């Protein structure tokens, strides 16, 4: 992953996907 | 400030992180045991699905508080909260000192609580505190 993608940005995507999956 | 709302948030988060680190049940130390069990199951799912990614993230020169505040800078939702807590529990166990039983549950739990309540205190109260997490019961 590009070092331009902030880490919190990556966790926010996990969390917003978790909402979709559940 | 450190009012009732603050402790309702902190006590749930810190008990979960203690349970994750120690493998001892902490549900009896929280008020809302039903929501605790939802939190625990949801964090377990996040960790099982994403631990390899978390491993890469943690291998770098990171400050966990910057990570937490990044997630919540502009908006909050329960998936975000769960992911923050899951990541931070996973992190806490990885950074435990070898020579003391210090897994930083205090600073980590306080940082998460502060990041939630500094901008989203009214949202959290309006969720009926942790009750709003119950939408993720199974």
Swiss-Prot record, chain B:
Keywords: Apoptosis, Host mitochondrion, Host-virus interaction, Inhibition of host apoptosis by viral BCL2-like protein, Modulation of host cell apoptosis by virus. The keyword tRNA-binding does not apply. It is found in: Host mitochondrion. GO terms for biological process: regulation of apoptotic process; symbiont-mediated suppression of host apoptosis. One of its GO terms (cellular component) is host cell mitochondrion. A motif (BH2) lies at residues 100-115. A motif (BH1) lies at residues 70-89. Its main location: host cell. It comes from the Viruses. Plays a role in the inhibition of host apoptosis by sequestering and inactivating multiple proapoptotic BCL-2 proteins, including BAK1 and BAX. Interacts with host BAX; this interaction inhibits BAX oligomerization and subsequent activation. Interacts with host BAK1. Belongs to the Bcl-2 family. This is Apoptosis regulator Bcl-2 homolog. The chain holds residues 6 to 143 of 175 of the full protein.
